[PDB]
Amino acid sequence: MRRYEVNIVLNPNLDQSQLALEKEIIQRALENYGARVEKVEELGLRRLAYPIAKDPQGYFLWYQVEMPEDRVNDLARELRIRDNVRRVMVVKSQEPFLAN
Amino acid sequence: PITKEEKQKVIQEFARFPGDTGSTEVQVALLTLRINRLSEHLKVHKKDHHSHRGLLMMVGQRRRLLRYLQREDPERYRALIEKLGIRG
Amino acid sequence: AKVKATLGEFDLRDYRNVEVLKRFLSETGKILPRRRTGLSAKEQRILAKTIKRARILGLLPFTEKLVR
Amino acid sequence: AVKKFKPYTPSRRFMTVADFSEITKTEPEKSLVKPLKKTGGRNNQGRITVRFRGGGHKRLYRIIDFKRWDKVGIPAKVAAIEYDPNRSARIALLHYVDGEKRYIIAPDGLQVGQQVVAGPDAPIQVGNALPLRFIPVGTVVHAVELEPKKGAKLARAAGTSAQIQGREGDYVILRLPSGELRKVHGECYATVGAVGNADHKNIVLGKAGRSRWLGRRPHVRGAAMNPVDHPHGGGEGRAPRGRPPASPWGWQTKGLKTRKRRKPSSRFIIARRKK
Amino acid sequence: QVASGRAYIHASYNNTIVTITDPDGNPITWSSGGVIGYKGSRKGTPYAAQLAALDAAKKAMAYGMQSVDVIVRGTGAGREQAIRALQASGLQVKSIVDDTPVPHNGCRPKKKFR
RNA sequence: UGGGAGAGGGUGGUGGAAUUCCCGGAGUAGCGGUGAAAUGCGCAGAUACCGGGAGGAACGCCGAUGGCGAAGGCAGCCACCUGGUCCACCCGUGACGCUGAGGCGCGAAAGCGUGGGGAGCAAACCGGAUUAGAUACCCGGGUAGUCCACGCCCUAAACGAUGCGCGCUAGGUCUCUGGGUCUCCUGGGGGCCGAAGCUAACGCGUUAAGCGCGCCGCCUGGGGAGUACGGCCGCAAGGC
Numbered sequence A: 001m002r003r004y005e006v007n008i009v010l011n012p013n014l015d016q017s018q019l020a021l022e023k024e025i026i027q028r029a030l031e032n033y034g035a036r037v038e039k040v041e042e043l044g045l046r047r048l049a050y051p052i053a054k055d056p057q058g059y060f061l062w063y064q065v066e067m068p069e070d071r072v073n074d075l076a077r078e079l080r081i082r083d084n085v086r087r088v089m090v091v092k093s094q095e096p097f098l099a100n
Numbered sequence B: 001p002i003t004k005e006e007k008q009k010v011i012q013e014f015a016r017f018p019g020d021t022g023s024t025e026v027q028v029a030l031l032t033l034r035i036n037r038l039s040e041h042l043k044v045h046k047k048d049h050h051s052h053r054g055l056l057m058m059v060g061q062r063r064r065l066l067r068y069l070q071r072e073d074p075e076r077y078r079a080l081i082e083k084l085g086i087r088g
Numbered sequence C: 001a002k003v004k005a006t007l008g009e010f011d012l013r014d015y016r017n018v019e020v021l022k023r024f025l026s027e028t029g030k031i032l033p034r035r036r037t038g039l040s041a042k043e044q045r046i047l048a049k050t051i052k053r054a055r056i057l058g059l060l061p062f063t064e065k066l067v068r
Numbered sequence D: 001a002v003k004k005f006k007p008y009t010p011s012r013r014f015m016t017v018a019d020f021s022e023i024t025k026t027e028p029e030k031s032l033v034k035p036l037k038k039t040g041g042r043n044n045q046g047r048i049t050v051r052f053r054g055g056g057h058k059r060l061y062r063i064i065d066f067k068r069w070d071k072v073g074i075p076a077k078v079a080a081i082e083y084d085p086n087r088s089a090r091i092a093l094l095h096y097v098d099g100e101k102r103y104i105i106a107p108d109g110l111q112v113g114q115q116v117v118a119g120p121d122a123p124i125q126v127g128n129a130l131p132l133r134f135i136p137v138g139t140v141v142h143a144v145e146l147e148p149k150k151g152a153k154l155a156r157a158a159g160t161s162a163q164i165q166g167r168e169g170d171y172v173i174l175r176l177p178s179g180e181l182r183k184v185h186g187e188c189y190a191t192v193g194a195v196g197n198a199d200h201k202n203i204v205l206g207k208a209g210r211s212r213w214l215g216r217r218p219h220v221r222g223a224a225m226n227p228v229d230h231p232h233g234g235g236e237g238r239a240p241r242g243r244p245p246a247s248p249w250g251w252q253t254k255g256l257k258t259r260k261r262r263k264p265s266s267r268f269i270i271a272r273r274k275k
Numbered sequence E: 001q002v003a004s005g006r007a008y009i010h011a012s013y014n015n016t017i018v019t020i021t022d023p024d025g026n027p028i029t030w031s032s033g034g035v036i037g038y039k040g041s042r043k044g045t046p047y048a049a050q051l052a053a054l055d056a057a058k059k060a061m062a063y064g065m066q067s068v069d070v071i072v073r074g075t076g077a078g079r080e081q082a083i084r085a086l087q088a089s090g091l092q093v094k095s096i097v098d099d100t101p102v103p104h105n106g107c108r109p110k111k112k113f114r
Numbered sequence F: 001u002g003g004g005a006g007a008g009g010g011u012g013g014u015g016g017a018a019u020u021c022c023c024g025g026a027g028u029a030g031c032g033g034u035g036a037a038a039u040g041c042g043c044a045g046a047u048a049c050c051g052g053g054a055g056g057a058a059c060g061c062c063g064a065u066g067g068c069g070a071a072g073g074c075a076g077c078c079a080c081c082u083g084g085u086c087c088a089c090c091c092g093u094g095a096c097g098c099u100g101a102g103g104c105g106c107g108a109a110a111g112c113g114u115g116g117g118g119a120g121c122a123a124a125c126c127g128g129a130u131u132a133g134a135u136a137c138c139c140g141g142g143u144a145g146u147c148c149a150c151g152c153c154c155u156a157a158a159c160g161a162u163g164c165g166c167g168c169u170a171g172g173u174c175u176c177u178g179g180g181u182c183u184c185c186u187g188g189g190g191g192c193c194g195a196a197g198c199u200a201a202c203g204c205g206u207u208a209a210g211c212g213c214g215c216c217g218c219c220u221g222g223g224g225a226g227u228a229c230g231g232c233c234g235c236a237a238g239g240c
């Protein structure tokens, strides 16, 4: 097991119930791939720096998780399988590096 | 990778006295463990020639240690290489 | 005026900190140099990578145009 | 991984044969084979209408499931990967948990023991059939229906694949094995992944007799014939074509396009092929 | 007809082409160092770019064009002269923005540019 | 044992800029190009502008006088797998070391084979100019190739033109990266300037080209010639 921060960005122009069906898919995906979800920070719609898929906004999910190191690629790829999942970034979690 | 737990089993199953961490046996054993993990990794990643240099350096290192233990103890040499299934 | 001064204590890896990180990009979207950033050698590499990530997550621009 | 031979005959020199590594069962499912009528290129009139055919190895035809919307939602187990002399792809025997058994053409990377399923809700997984409108854009796909419920017409030979490029209304945009870009209805089924046995094009027949085994009788050059036979016939000694290169029947055979202009599918061919 | 629009200055070391668009970027009219009888090296001079800009605005203002946001591309010597000309034409130059294409180290340049 | 830095390597994925092309819009008399031109392209609607699409390659800023690697070489970003290396504690083994003819493996670019891919670029090639000529430089085109996979080739100004290891002989200064008690002290790299000394001089100078020891490789006037013959390797080119 290792700790990863799974970033996901969704389709903003979705009702919260389509948005619910997508999170449930994600949920079952993290579930069936071995992740144990610690924290979960869901910032929602957010103004984009540049247009993504013709959309200046996205719905930003974030999951601190703990999964077997040898399946995070397959999981991440599986998150991308959906068309409303416009971005996914799984990162290795690190203790912070600070200034001041 | 090798984790601290598997690495200690190797030291445990090869220490001479349950505190020893640097004898020829525990070194040959520790190298043999790096090699096979690497030797297998190279069998999949055939173009990782840089890591292969690492493989040769550990092989030479173990061979020099095995050359030393055969001088000081042909009996314990033979005992070590069999427990690691090494000769070829 | 350097950015490490113009900001209190921050985490050089929170790639989600747009308010902290955007302060490290010129008016034209480029990663500022240490002569503007004020970070050290080792700090500058960390900042840029986490800037680079936030660009991929759409949190920071890769480039903005120049206004007069 | 095509196999070579040491040069212990003239022909063994260059001959190559498939490795058949992935084949797991070597006699066909008796319930799914019927006799394949060798034509020799002859039609119902008895006439040769395709020259240089015949005399090849006897074959049983394996019935292949080109629909698969036949059995929506019914999971199936890949039980065997078999040889099939009637196509370039290998074939896979599916034991549907239904108890029903069917052959599909075998996609690359398909593993005996895995499960496949057909339907709108099938996971985007190699071997699964879905209507085109539900496969993600960018996905590589094969055994594609050309028209809804008419059956898999596209990307069926060893190695081929169509790629899903975009959607427009009821239609999807496919890059066919030829590189042609074409509109195909979203209801048309396709199976995720490329056809397997992609090494099939690297086989070297190696001797004349191997073409005979395949039913391919020897081709005779027009230039080798006489003028009653062929445009290129005749001449004292050898002879260049001496006219635009023609078929036996007179039509030009270097670049002369032959697709019909007013064909209805033109409204669906986006861009002609490549290379 | 439209009142406000955008003014685009494509300007290389060869020429300076001004096209005035509408708010939607659809061109209202255009001009360049060729629309004023210069052919050749002269098409790339500052004066050429001035007349090109003046012929651009005088053609667009003749469509009711009053306000332009000035988008500037290239680096040719007729660049600054074009912006100056647009503020002197009579147009309500509401902006100047440099949108020169710059790759993030992409396609290999011609030998002339390596 | 516990830590740290890193474009070290391999695999899968993935982001934005940009160019080319296609489509739709809108729009008109040119564009492009050079020293100046022409070729080219453009009323068959180009260029310039917007929107959409495809595909390829390369990763701007960070970025450095930087880092890593044995060398060649390595630069978006993410994960996986893997190497080397450095530091601390001074815990374990007890000289187990150094080098290294052969051997083996690695080895820029180009080139070669079988597939694939092909946006840009561009040997060849064509055209335009220049010129006495111009099989060049400059311009417009342009096929290999550049890219991927696998297999070959094994070359180089493969350079620090400086083999490897150890020990010893002032410091000043800048920097990367560890440790400390964090002024500063100490390691390990990267440069600079310089003591003694070396050097034909230029220069070198704790990153020796100084003082020593070990081992290896190599030189013995220029041309002929890295050619011939032989032999080995290679598909060939050609290498040794």
Ligand SMILES: [Mg+2]
Pocket: A080, A081, A082, A083, A084, A085, A086
């Ligand atoms: Mg998606």
Ligand SMILES: [Mg+2]
Pocket: A093, A094, A096, C013, C014, C015
């Ligand atoms: Mg963090």
Ligand SMILES: [Mg+2]
Pocket: D003, D004, D005, D006, D012, D013, D014, D015, D016
């Ligand atoms: Mg053979």
Ligand SMILES: [Mg+2]
Pocket: D006, D007
């Ligand atoms: Mg033989």
Ligand SMILES: [Mg+2]
Pocket: D006, D007
């Ligand atoms: Mg042989």
Ligand SMILES: [Mg+2]
Pocket: D019, D020, D021, D022, D023, D090, D197
């Ligand atoms: Mg097979």
Ligand SMILES: [Mg+2]
Pocket: D030
């Ligand atoms: Mg029967």
Ligand SMILES: [Mg+2]
Pocket: D037, D039
């Ligand atoms: Mg029949």
Ligand SMILES: [Mg+2]
Pocket: D044
């Ligand atoms: Mg009949």
Ligand SMILES: [Mg+2]
Pocket: none
């Ligand atoms: Mg009859």
Ligand SMILES: [Mg+2]
Pocket: none
């Ligand atoms: Mg009859």
Ligand SMILES: [Mg+2]
Pocket: D049, D050, D051
């Ligand atoms: Mg026929």
Ligand SMILES: [Mg+2]
Pocket: D040, D041, D042, D048, D049, D050, D051, D052, D053, D054
């Ligand atoms: Mg026939």
Ligand SMILES: [Mg+2]
Pocket: D086, D087, D088
């Ligand atoms: Mg067939």
Ligand SMILES: [Mg+2]
Pocket: D082, D083, D084, D085, D087, D088, D089, D090, D091
């Ligand atoms: Mg078959």
Ligand SMILES: [Mg+2]
Pocket: D146, D147, D148, D183, D184, D185, D188
């Ligand atoms: Mg159709």
